[PDB]
Amino acid sequence: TRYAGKVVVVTGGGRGIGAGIVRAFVNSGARVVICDKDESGGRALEQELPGAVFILCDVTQEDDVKTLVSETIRRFGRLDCVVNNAGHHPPPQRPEETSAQGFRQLLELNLLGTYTLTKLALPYLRKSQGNVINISSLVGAIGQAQAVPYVATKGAVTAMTKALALDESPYGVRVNCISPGNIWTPLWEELAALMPDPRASIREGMLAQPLGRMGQPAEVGAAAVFLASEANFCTGIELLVTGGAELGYGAKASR
Template structure:
């Protein structure tokens, strides 16, 4: 039996929960050796134990705070010490803060979010690229459908994601001379712990989730594993794609809907 990413070495940031977990799972199921990180140990170690039992690939959890440059350097160094090379970097760790108006948002909050959602993607790419170039590997940046749609009371989040999509294109240009492909994956609504946490902040969480499910033409939210399959497509199969933004959105960006917020 042949696996689509057999013996390839991948680094996945924010891999202990949600979309990152789906990516780690699909990569291991396809034969990859994955190093993944998060801040919390318990979920990371539990996932590592579960996936290593099933194989055929393997994974190693490394505690790492992606908002800290030294942690990022350590995670890349750990990967190379253990696996000698890196074939793919998936930048995924990020956060969507609770919805807030621009008036209520401080510069400090925006700067912290930029640091986690954008600068960490840049730094992980910077430290992984010397190894990716040797293997003619690729980077997959998890961005967001909000880059296309915008989103209410979320200007800093949407701005960080827009910058990820733009940075992806710029790095695709730069790294073409090294045969490294750089793409992004933009999920729409995907049911994850983050989505659930944000729903809990609304007056009726169950109703918010129901509305979220109806926002896609496909009539449901996406799953972690579907995001994993889309990331694997970019890493393993999309060898003629660089600088693209793959929407994994269930068609949420199509058709007209009731969007005006001005009471008639």
């Protein structure tokens, strides 16, 4: 009932954090459009959840995004909230191992895809006095080792959130972001499998938080529903969902 009658688009909603956000909004009473470039997860989610439908869309293709917005309006008549969750973390890479072309490609997904959907949705969000929620990362704020391009893209997302909150405030459209820490998702599982010692890498990821565990997609989802439905005086904020990983001293050097 908390967000009943509202219409929500979630990008990258087929698995992981995105799927947790989809479930949270459905459980809140909203109708949800699942955007994803992969069919398998999103199509099953649509079969599972009444009130969720899947639309195939690669957020780096402007025509895909144009079609995503116009199909949402044609099928549901309004748009109240856009959750820009689609993104990717490459394998760990030393700075000298990165390239400018890989950096550009990551900017297309993590940053320009967020920019494009937000721009095309804003005319409808103004009509509904809706809101924008970007999924950024704690490492945009504190940095990360072996991830120069990834960290740069999330620093941009968090900053862009504040700029757009300023521009859209006169229209009553709020723009906020969530900065998760280590959340246990298929990407976390995939990247750990490439590590020399997968079990050790997962152990270290759980101990990076004072709480002693990683986060869950449903916990990012609850934060998103809060920002959409009950945070009417919040705009341009960065909501940390990190288990306290940024607090206090810890071992940062190995020698």
